[PDB]
Design a binder for this molecule. Structure first.
Ligand SMILES: O=C(O)c1cccc(-c2ccc3ncccc3c2)c1
Ligand SMILES: [Cl-]
Length: 242
């Protein structure tokens, strides 16, 4: 069962923002959100799609391991961190689109489509460009669907090797200390309206896991830091992190 906690809206309103946060208590199998409607509204995954893309590239041998270097093609793009060599860890950390567009081309439409159906990922529709459908194509996914996919990955239940799933979960590592571990992936969709930011992942505790997925209206790149800020305020309010 799902519970709607509209008090979280305060964290969005304080920044004149609109969005949704969805949480899932794994131990209790209970979900919580500030907006049931938007939690079930499907959006472009944008760079959150690098989770399934990584999984598929690894399982098919397109990527040998997390150390294989993907060389910069020398074409200068306006994101400084993209103009250099990367491996799977750094490409994920810096959301390096062009590296993953190359992953997608080597996967191919047929294998990509079959894999996303096996993952039951979003609408499973890669209609459009094989290498950009997650940025301007037809694939859509909601916050609650993100959680369901993430839960399978955490439990190694996706239809790829255990090894592929362990490597991707390593690459998702975002923050860790004595209080919690966060494995997550950001997203920023700008080529189709409405422009939004994503943050999806989970919080590991000593004896529980809290999965989360949030998106928010992102008319300008200036509010990107709010994806994490708002999520952590919700996590603090719910006593999940200090
Ligand atoms: O957050 C992501 O996952 C992501 C993924 C791909 C691109 C960007 C991005 C693009 C333009 C920016 N322009 C200004 C400042 C920051 C910017 C970030 C972010
Ligand atoms: Cl790890």
């Amino acid at each position: 069962e799902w519970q709607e906690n509209k008090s979280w809206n305060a964290h969005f309103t304080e920044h004149k923002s609109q969005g949704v946060v969805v949480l899932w208590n794994e131990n209790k199998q209970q979900g919580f959100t500030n907006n049931l409607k938007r939690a079930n509204q499907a959006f472009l995954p944008a760079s959150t799609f690098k989770i399934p893309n990584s999984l598929i590239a690894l399982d098919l041998g397109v990527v040998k391991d997390e150390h294989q270097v993907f060389k910069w093609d020398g074409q200068t793009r306006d994101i400084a961190t993209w103009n250099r060599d990367h491996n799977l860890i750094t490409a994920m950390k810096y959301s390096v689109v062009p590296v993953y567009q190359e992953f997608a081309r080597q996967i191919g439409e047929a294998r990509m489509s079959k894999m996303l159906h096996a993952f039951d990922y979003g609408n499973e529709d890669i209609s459009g460009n094989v290498d950009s459908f997650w940025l301007d194509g037809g694939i859509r996914i909601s916050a609650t669907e993100q959680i369901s996919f993430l839960r399978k990955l955490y439990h190694n239940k996706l239809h790829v090797s255990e090894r592929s799933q362990r490597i991707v979960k390593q690459a998702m590592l975002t923050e860790a200390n004595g209080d919690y571990i966060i494995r997550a992936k950001t997203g920023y969709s700008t080529r189709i309206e409405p422009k939004i930011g994503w943050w999806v992942g989970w919080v590991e505790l000593d004896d529980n896991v809290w999965f989360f997925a949030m998106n928010m209206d992102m008319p300008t790149s200036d509010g990107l830091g709010l994806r994490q800020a708002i999520t952590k305020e919700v996590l603090k309010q719910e006593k999940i992190i200090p």
